Structure formats: structure tokens, C-alpha cells
């Protein structure tokens, strides 16, 4: 059974090949205590990783090891992988090959560092590394299409063809879940709620996942929200306080389609998807339009499928047909696609064996698995 | 002439447009006698507002109507404004327009009640609300730079590239002069001095204003103070006792650059300036670096400009040059900038007329003012 | 066989590590005669300390060497420790380490002289100085909760979450049982009983320890006490006189919740605990509401637990469940908690050895103890 570990900026999913759901899904944070300890004999640890950090997040400084898709701290990344195998999964990687997932347009330094870290610290027998966006379409069951990969890192639009990522057609986008979370607390201060610390950032993320939604029409919804109190909903903080949000429900997710709210010159995810398609060839343009698949936790807002379809329809020519595919399992689309690829019989051919790694060195990752 | 009232968390300044200095500067405190009146010869008013309460602060419970730039008690705020117009400025508000100041990233209800009070209690012909940090740049004769304002409640960094401030790059911290005063009396107990009541709080503020200074090198200065003498200063209390403070002279201002002493996860006043600049465009970063402006009473410590320059230089790339501008009259920079704006002929069309407020109610303050 | 000495403002409890109750408990008063002896046969001494002073309290002038948790007379403090070790415990401190307790937010010079005196007059092998509130949580066996330690001179609240204390949320109030005793004798003159001398203060303290109680509703109980005589109780003075106290039973403990009676501006103990919790983070507030711990002799009034629960519930959000822990042995919680600390195997690495003190001096206690 080959492990399928999908590291991510927000959450990392781990499990086994052939399963339909990840075994362990915990936040990818590494918190350290900022206060000195007074009670002796408790055996308190120095660093808390995963669910332990979230439970005790009040007295910790939560730092995300991965920011904007690049690992800014390679010492904390080893801590999370160590916690994934021994603690959450309780399986020694000595007898199980490990599958890792990259990000589109990843620097070559990260590619070799991931191979070097695991082949020595964990010494797994075999490895294969694949693109997260590529695996997103594999879970949906189609090999050709354009993936609107979004998450807590950076939004990527990768129009893969025949299971291969087009390198020139990939368009980056920094609009992600973290930006909306930071933007939500900036506009929540207008009602008198002040969330500033990193511990309270997790609280805002819970609000975004439960109450926020995408409105079909922004101008129509704005007038309705001001006139009537129907749109207001109540949320309860961990301390017992009750808060009310009236029109922030459809104003924070709207920043995806209108980045000018955050002050970014780049266009929204509706126009980036259209721009990426235009970069591809004319003949294969027909197939990509009808096989667009959303992925990641950012695209889980209610009504985002309808808003995206309507707005991309106007930009696209009237001859083109739009079919936004939004599977309900799109949160774990990256992991599920990885499990499908690992379980394949022909997948044994492109393993990176431990014996082959020593003779070739860390540079084998560039040419073997691409 | 147009009255320019700059209500502040600690002190409020009121005057006339075109003047070079505020006419009246008194503390923004409202006190009520906790003890029972025993004599009948004198008036023995219910409450005292301004410097009247400061003189009799022994027998009163001083309460600040403004906390962190938000008016917590609107009953006491009406007392202060009634005292400003009728006792200090001794003018009728019914004939002169009034210009007010509000901190950025404030609750919408804070400036909505300000419009309602002005147009219903004092019947001012016109009104306007302006950002405190924006006016601080006008007093220095600049229209392109970053303003580091710091008072009693708010310490906000507002990068202003043009006549209008950049909204997406505004950073606000709830660490200011009042927070340092509470920290100064906490570490003063280490030497055996106990200041608890609000009347004793005003004594600590005098000590902070006269003896505290920012050390260029905190680690080196702590070792120097460990050798005793050459750094202890003597202060005389209103009772008559003489107190000596050693390393507390620079420890209290050091909480600005190291907020971890107060248990706040927020970054220091030096990092929050660099972070604010990083949110702007690449082309504009060159101008903002060389046009940094300090303002407010908190930044009046001896040597804060020198210390701030060193900290920013290490964080900023060595190619860029850092020039911190510290005008001699930066205490009244907020009011002086407002005087220039009010006296401008173009500003006559930006006033909110009485008829305009009636047709739209208090909500017009959000759409017109900024 | 570590000694655990818990010196307090009123009573000092000294015993042995590993036991369940203090070995010797005697009042911490040092009294000297104000007359001149006439009989030469009797072996009169110079000063009387401990239970000996209480027996002859009618002649001596009782003086408390500890005031508000601060040793105001170091000459007398040595006498109590000299009497404790060689008369009550009857052990030599030259072979056993000594554990001492000190209130938080105390002058740094207080614990500096504590280390110097024992290490030079008694020559103890080791030392450790612990916060009184921290030890109180050890007795309960818990690890998370806000501890209210109301003693004889100091009322302080120290919140602790998962063994990590929060130094910025510690609130200290200089209002405790001794101040209530001073207030009780002030209102006892309203009935015709005059207690002025320091010897008669101990008589008032005996009245408070037996008859005073905390009323659930002060406004309702005040009317009832003035309309009937069911609340009146009779107490017998040492001289044989019988006194009757009515509404003063629930008025003296009422100064804890309404310090305005004493003329102080500080908030009540119910508001101080709530203010301490509010200083903490949002995520840890839920666990601190359900783990409130009371200790000290001041919190032994009948019904103080019920009154505190009602008062906090009004301030706290309705959704939260306030659970106040009132163990029957909360009087000796500080000592019992210190017994567990001294007997722990992990604690043997935190003793302040003689060699460590020799190389540095009295300042070693600052960097080795919280």
C-alpha cells in the first residue's frame, strides 16, 4: 500500500492507496509557546503540530510553514511530515512507498529538496511526485480539461491535456483563501469586531467556511441587504459572544471575481480562466471549454458554480458552450486523484527506487518523474 | 472661519481655520465625585470636564470617553463638545462649520453618531470627517509618503501616495501611549512604587512624558544600567516624595518595538511600517521609503527617530535609502493639517450641508466623507 | 525532607514535604511589651512571636512584620523563621532545602532579601520561591483555571492555561481580610462597641471568622435585617460581655464586592476576576470560565461561592457555564500545593543551589524563579 501524502498550505491529507477518503486531515501549522511554563512535571513539548496546535492555539504563535506555495521553513516542514507518518497514520515509511504532490510552476530547488529530505530522513523505498492540478482532473475521471485549482496558497489555472500539464498556458493568481481571510477581518471591523492575532485568524476562517457565500448579482444583493435584515446571520464565538454579519457574507467571496477590492491589478478568477484557455491552441479549445473542473477548498462557496458559469459565458463567444463541473468531493480532489494514480498497475514503472537514487543523486527527480 | 475640532483619545485640540496653533488644548476626561458633598457654599457641579477635572482629580473618578479611538460613552462626549464650543472656544456652533477627525479602520457607527450629534444638538451649518493620519502629512507640506501616527489609542500606518490615502495598505495597531502607561506602572511596582487608581494614572503619564526615552541598542543599554548610576533620574511626586527609576526609563518605550512584553502577538512599530510599504506598488515603494513622517505624542520620545531609522534599514533592502522626517511640532500635526485643508478654497464644495443630511440621514457620512 | 514554609500576612504554615496538612500553624505576629516588668522571678523575654504572643496579647503591642504581602520589617521576619525552624518544626535547616512562597507583582527587593537571609543566617542547602496562586492550582490537581487567592493582605488572580501562565493578565488587589477587619471595627461603633487597640483587633477578627457571611442579594437582605431580628447573633467577648451584631454580618464581607465602602476606586473581586479573564485570549476563555478556583482564608465566608457565581454569570455571556470550585480545605491550598511540588521528582533540577548563589549573589533568584 503506497502512501498518498498531499502537503498543502492550509491542510495536509494523508492516507493509503485505494481508499476513497484520506485517513488523517489536520491543519498544517507548527505552533510554539510564547509564554514561559510555570507548572513543572507536565512534560510539555517544545513545538505542537497539527490538531494539537489548534486545540491549544490560545497560547501559541501559529506559523504556517508554507506561504504562497513556497516552503519558507524547511525545518518545520520536516516536523509536519514526521507527525503525519508516526502519529496520525501510525505507519513506518520503511515498508511503504510515499507519493508527494507538487504545485504548478514549482522551483527546481523545492523539487530536489523534497526528494533529498524524505530519501534520507525517512528513507522510503520509492517515490513519485505529481502536480496537484493534474491529480484534480484524475479524481473527476477525465484526463483533458482546465483545472481552476484554488486553495489557501495561490490560485492556479492549469489546462492539462492528455494528462500532461501545459507549461506555457499556466497562469498564476495570488487570490486564495488566506487573502479572503485577511480581507474578511479588515471589513469585519466596520461592524465593531476586531480580530487581529493569529489565534483569532482561525476563528475568522471558521466564519468564512460556514456563513460566507457568493451572490449571483452583486449590485442587486447590496440593495437588498441594506433594506432588509433577512440576510443577517448569527455566529457564536468560542467565548460565548454572539456576532452578526449583514452584508459581509457576499462581500468577502466577491473579492475573487473583483480583485480591485484588495487593490490587485490582476483580473478575477473568471477572467484568468478565460485568459488561460486563449493561450492554448485553437483546435483543442473546444474540448477545454466543456471540461472545466473546479478544485480546492476555496471553490466550495455556495453559488460559485452558477456565478462562474454566468460570468465566463459573456466573455466566451456565443458559439462556445460552458459546462462548469463542480463535484461535491472537490475538497479532497487532489488526494483522491493521487490515490487513483497510485493504485494503477502500470504506476510501478515510474517509481524512483532507492537504489537508483544513490547512483544518480538528487538530480534524478527532474528527469525521472518530471 | 470654520472650527477645526480634533477629538483625541488623550487630549482634544480645538481652534480656528487658518491659525498656526490650536486655541484650546485640554485633556479629554470627564470626572464625577465619588464622595458625598458635605458643604453647601459652593456650586459642587455634578461633573467636571477638561482641565477643571485635572485640578480636582484627587476626589474624582476620571473616565476617558474615547478608548482606542472609539467613543465608548456618547453621554460624556456630548459634555466635552459642549465644553469646547461654549467654554473654551466661546463661539456659537450654529454659525461656523465644524471639521472633525476620525481614525482609519473604525466602526461605521462611530462616525455615524458623530454626524447625528453635530446636526441635531449643535445645529452646525456644515460638517466633515477626515482621517487623522492624512492630515498629518499635510502639515509637513507633502503629498506623497507614509505617516506613522501614534497617540493614546491607535498607532496606524497610512501610506499616502497622492492627495488620497491608499485604503488597502492601511495597518492599525491597538498599542499606543495609553498602553505604555499601563505597562510603566506594572514594572514600577518592581521598585516598590504602587500606582493603581485613575488619579494615580495621571502621575505616571507625567513620568513617562519627562523621563522615558528610546534606547538605540536595548541589549547594550540594559548591561550599562546593570552597573548602576549614570542613568537613574529623580522625580518629585505631588505628595512630595522623590522616586528614582533606573532601567525603567527605556524599558517602557521599548514595548513599542517589542510588543511581546505586553503579551500581544502584533508586530512592532518598526515592522508594521515595513509591512505597510510592502503592500504598495513596486514603483511607489521608492517614494514612500524616503518620505516617512512621524506624528502624534507617542513619537515624541528622545531618540525614537534615530532608533526607527536603524530598524527599518536592516529590514529594507540596502539599495533603498531611509529618511525619517520628525517635524518639531509633530504633537499638533493632526490639527495643523486640518487647518490647511479647511482654509482651502476648493474644500468649500466638500462640506455636508444641513439639507443634504436631512434627505439621507446619518448614513450620508460614509458616502461623502473619507 | 524539604521544608515547605508558606509565610503569610496573618498566618504562616510550616511543615514537611510529602504530608497532607501543615505541621505547625501559628499567627505571624511579633509583639513586645509596652510596660516594665515588676516581678524579677518570672523569666520575661524581650519579644514574643507566634502563639505565645496571642496568649499574652493584652499586654504586648502586636505588630505584623508582613504587610500587604511585603515584609515591612526584616528584623522581625528573621525572628519568625528562627522561631519556626527551632521551636515548631524542631529541625535544622542546614540539611533540608526550603521552599518559600511570595505574592505576584511584588517588589523585586522582597525576594532578593529572602534569598540572602536564609543563605547566610540559616545556610540552607537549596531554595525555590514560588507564586502563591500557582501552588493553589497544584492542590486541586488541575492544570487549567484562573486561581483567586484572597489571603490576609493580597487578593490576586493568576490565570493558567495548560501549565503556561499569562503574566499580562495577572491582577492584584490590595484588599483582603485585614482591610475587612479594619472596616468591621469601623461600623461596629454604629452600635456602641469601640475597638481601637491592636490587641482588640484580634477580638474583631474572631467575630468576623464566626458570624460574618456573604448575602446573596445585598439590597434585599438590607431591608429584611431592618424589619426583623432573625439575623441578629450574639457573641461573647473574652471579658464576659455579650454583644449583638445585626446587619453588620453581611456588610463587612460586602466590601469585597463593593470596595466603594472603603473609599477605594478598585473594582470588586467578582469584577477583578472577570477583568482578568477578559485580558486572556478568546480561545482560552471557555476553559477558564468552567475552572475557577477559590483559595485563601478570605474566601471562607458562608455563601461566597454562590454570590460569586451569580455576579460573574451576569457579566459573562449567557451561553457560558460558570463553575466555581470551592474545596473544603481551600484554607491550606497554598501549602498543600507546595507539598506536591517539593516531592516531585522533576522539581529536583530547579533548586537554587548554594554554588549558584555564590557566583552571582541575591540576583540569581530573578532568573531562576517566576
Amino acid at each position: 500500500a503506497a502512501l498518498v501524502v498531499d502537503n498543502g498550505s492550509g491542510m495536509c491529507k494523508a492516507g493509503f492507496a485505494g481508499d476513497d477518503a484520506p485517513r488523517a486531515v489536520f491543519p498544517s501549522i507548527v505552533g510554539r509557546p510564547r509564554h514561559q511554563g510555570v507548572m513543572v512535571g507536565m512534560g510539555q513539548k517544545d513545538s505542537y503540530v497539527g490538531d494539537e496546535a489548534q486545540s491549544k492555539r490560545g497560547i501559541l504563535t501559529l506559523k504556517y510553514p508554507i506561504e504562497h506555495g513556497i516552503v519558507t521553513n524547511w525545518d518545520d516542514m520536516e516536523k509536519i511530515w514526521h507527525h503525519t507518518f508516526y502519529n496520525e497514520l501510525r505507519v513506518a515509511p520503511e515498508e511503504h512507498p510515499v507519493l508527494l504532490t507538487e504545485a504548478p510552476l514549482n522551483p527546481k530547488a523545492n523539487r530536489e529538496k523534497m526528494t533529498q529530505i524524505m530519501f534520507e530522513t525517512f528513507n522510503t523505498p520509492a517515490m513519485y511526485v505529481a502536480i496537484q492540478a493534474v491529480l484534480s482532473l484524475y479524481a473527476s475521471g477525465r484526463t483533458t480539461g482546465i483545472v481552476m485549482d484554488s486553495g489557501d496558497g495561490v490560485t492556479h489555472t492549469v489546462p492539462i491535456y492528455e494528462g500532461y500539464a501545459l507549461p506555457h498556458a499556466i497562469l498564476r493568481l495570488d487570490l486564495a483563501g488566506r487573502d479572503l481571510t485577511d480581507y474578511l477581518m479588515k471589513i469585519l471591523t466596520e461592524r465593531g469586531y476586531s480580530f487581529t492575532t493569529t489565534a483569532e485568524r482561525e476563528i475568522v476562517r471558521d466564519i468564512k467556511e460556514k456563513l460566507c457565500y457568493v451572490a449571483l448579482d452583486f449590485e442587486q444583493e447590496m440593495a437588498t441587504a441594506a433594506s432588509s435584515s433577512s440576510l443577517e446571520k448569527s455566529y457564536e464565538l468560542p467565548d460565548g459572544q454572539v456576532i452578526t454579519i449583514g452584508n459581509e457574507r457576499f462581500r468577502c467571496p466577491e473579492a475573487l471575481f473583483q480583485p480591485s477590492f484588495l487593490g490587485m491589478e490582476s483580473a478575477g478568477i473568471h477572467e484568468t480562466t478565460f485568459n488561460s484557455i486563449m493561450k492554448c491552441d485553437v483546435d483543442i479549445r473546444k474540448d477545454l471549454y466543456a471540461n472545466t473542473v473546479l478544485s480546492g477548498g476555496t471553490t466550495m462557496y455556495p453559488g460559485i458554480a452558477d456565478r462562474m458559469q454566468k460570468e465566463i459565458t459573456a466573455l466566451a463567444p456565443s458559439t462556445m458552450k460552458i459546462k462548469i463541473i463542480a463535484p461535491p468531493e472537490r475538497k479532497y480532489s487532489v488526494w483522491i486523484g493521487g490515490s487513483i494514480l497510485a493504485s494503477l498497475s502500470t504506476f510501478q514503472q515510474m517509481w524512483i527506487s532507492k537504489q537508483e537514487y544513490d547512483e544518480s543523486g538528487p538530480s534524478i527527480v527532474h528527469r525521472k518523474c518530471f | 472661519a470654520a472650527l477645526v475640532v480634533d477629538n483625541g483619545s488623550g487630549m482634544c485640540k480645538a481652534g480656528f481655520a487658518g491659525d498656526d496653533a490650536p486655541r484650546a488644548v485640554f485633556p479629554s476626561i470627564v470626572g464625577r465625585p465619588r464622595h458625598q458633598g458635605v458643604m453647601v457654599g459652593m456650586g459642587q457641579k455634578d461633573s467636571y470636564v477638561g482641565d477643571e477635572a485635572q485640578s480636582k482629580r484627587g476626589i474624582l473618578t476620571l473616565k476617558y470617553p474615547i478608548e482606542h479611538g472609539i467613543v465608548t460613552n456618547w453621554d460624556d462626549m456630548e459634555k466635552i463638545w459642549h465644553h469646547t464650543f461654549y467654554n473654551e472656544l466661546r463661539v456659537a456652533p450654529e454659525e461656523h462649520p465644524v471639521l472633525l477627525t476620525e481614525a482609519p479602520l473604525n466602526p461605521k457607527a462611530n462616525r455615524e453618531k458623530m454626524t447625528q450629534i453635530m446636526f441635531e444638538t449643535f445645529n452646525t451649518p456644515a460638517m466633515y470627517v477626515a482621517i487623522q493620519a492624512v492630515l498629518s502629512l499635510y502639515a509637513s507640506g507633502r503629498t506623497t509618503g507614509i505617516v506613522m501616527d501614534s497617540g493614546d489609542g491607535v498607532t496606524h500606518t497610512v501610506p499616502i501616495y497622492e492627495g488620497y490615502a491608499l485604503p488597502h495598505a492601511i495597518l492599525r495597531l491597538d498599542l499606543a501611549g495609553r498602553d505604555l502607561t499601563d505597562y510603566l506602572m506594572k514594572i514600577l511596582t518592581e521598585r516598590g512604587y504602587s500606582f493603581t487608581t485613575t488619579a494615580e494614572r495621571e502621575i505616571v503619564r507625567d513620568i513617562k512624558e519627562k523621563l522615558c526615552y528610546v534606547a538605540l541598542d536595548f541589549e547594550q543599554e540594559m548591561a550599562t544600567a546593570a552597573s548602576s548610576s549614570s542613568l537613574e533620574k529623580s522625580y518629585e511626586l505631588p505628595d512630595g516624595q522623590v522616586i528614582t527609576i533606573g532601567n525603567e526609563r527605556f524599558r517602557c518605550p521599548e514595548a513599542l518595538f517589542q510588543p511581546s512584553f505586553l503579551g500581544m502577538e502584533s508586530a512592532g512599530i518598526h515592522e508594521t511600517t515595513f509591512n505597510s510599504i510592502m503592500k504598495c506598488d513596486v514603483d511607489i515603494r521608492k517614494d514612500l521609503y524616503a518620505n516617512t513622517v512621524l506624528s502624534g505624542g507617542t513619537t515624541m520620545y528622545p531618540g525614537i527617530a534615530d532608533r526607527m531609522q536603524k530598524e527599518i534599514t536592516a529590514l529594507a533592502p540596502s539599495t533603498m535609502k531611509i529618511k525619517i522626517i520628525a517635524p518639531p511640532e509633530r504633537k499638533y500635526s493632526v490639527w495643523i493639517g486640518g487647518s490647511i485643508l479647511a482654509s482651502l478654497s476648493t474644500f468649500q464644495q466638500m462640506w455636508i450641508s444641513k439639507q443634504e443630511y436631512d434627505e439621507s440621514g446619518p448614513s450620508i457620512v460614509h458616502r461623502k466623507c473619507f | 525532607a524539604a521544608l515547605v514554609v508558606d509565610n503569610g500576612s496573618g498566618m504562616c504554615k510550616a511543615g514537611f514535604a510529602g504530608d497532607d496538612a501543615p505541621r505547625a500553624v501559628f499567627p505571624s505576629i511579633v509583639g513586645r511589651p509596652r510596660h516594665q516588668g515588676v516581678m524579677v522571678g518570672m523569666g520575661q523575654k524581650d519579644s514574643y512571636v507566634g502563639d505565645e504572643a496571642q496568649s499574652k496579647r493584652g499586654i504586648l503591642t502586636l505588630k505584623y512584620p508582613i504587610e500587604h504581602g511585603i515584609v515591612t520589617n526584616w528584623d522581625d521576619m528573621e525572628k519568625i523563621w528562627h522561631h519556626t525552624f527551632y521551636n515548631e518544626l524542631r529541625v535544622a535547616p542546614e540539611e533540608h532545602p526550603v521552599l518559600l512562597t511570595e505574592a505576584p507583582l511584588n517588589p523585586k527587593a522582597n525576594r532578593e532579601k529572602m534569598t540572602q537571609i536564609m543563605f547566610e543566617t540559616f545556610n540552607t542547602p537549596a531554595m525555590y520561591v514560588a507564586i502563591q496562586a500557582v501552588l493553589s492550582l497544584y492542590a486541586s490537581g488541575r492544570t487549567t483555571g484562573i486561581v483567586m487567592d484572597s489571603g490576609d493582605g493580597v487578593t490576586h488572580t493568576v490565570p493558567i492555561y495548560e501549565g503556561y501562565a499569562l503574566p499580562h493578565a495577572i491582577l492584584r488587589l490590595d484588599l483582603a481580610g485585614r482591610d475587612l477587619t479594619d472596616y468591621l471595627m469601623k461600623i461596629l461603633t454604629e452600635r456602641g462597641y469601640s475597638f481601637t487597640t491592636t490587641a482588640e483587633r484580634e477580638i474583631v477578627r474572631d467575630i468576623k471568622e464566626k458570624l460574618c457571611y456573604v448575602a446573596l442579594d445585598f439590597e434585599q437582605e438590607m431591608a429584611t435585617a431592618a424589619s426583623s431580628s432573625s439575623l441578629e447573633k450574639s457573641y461573647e467577648l473574652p471579658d464576659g460581655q455579650v454583644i449583638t451584631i445585626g446587619n453588620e454580618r453581611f456588610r463587612c464581607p460586602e466590601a469585597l464586592f463593593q470596595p466603594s465602602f472603603l473609599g477605594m476606586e478598585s473594582a470588586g473581586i467578582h469584577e477583578t476576576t472577570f477583568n482578568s479573564i477578559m485580558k486572556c485570549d478568546v480561545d482560552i476563555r471557555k476553559d477558564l470560565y468552567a475552572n475557577t478556583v477559590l483559595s485563601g482564608g478570605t474566601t471562607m465566608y458562608p455563601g461566597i461561592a454562590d454570590r460569586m457565581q451569580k455576579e460573574i454569570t451576569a457579566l459573562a455571556p449567557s451561553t457560558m457555564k460558570i463553575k466555581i470550585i470551592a474545596p473544603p480545605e481551600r484554607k491550606y491550598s497554598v501549602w498543600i500545593g507546595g507539598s506536591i511540588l517539593a516531592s516531585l521528582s522533576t522539581f529536583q533540577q530547579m533548586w537554587i543551589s548554594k554554588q549558584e548563589y555564590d557566583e552571582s549573589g541575591p540576583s540569581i533568584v530573578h532568573r531562576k524563579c517566576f
Binding site: 465593531g192 469586531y193 476586531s194 480580530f195 483569532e200 | 482606542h68 472609539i70 | -
Partner: peptide
């Protein structure tokens, strides 16, 4: 404030 801080 309402939720957070004291203001």
C-alpha cells in the same frame, strides 16, 4: 469594540 478588545 464589541467582539475583541475592550472598546
Amino acid at each position: 469594540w464589541x467582539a475583541x478588545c475592550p472598546a
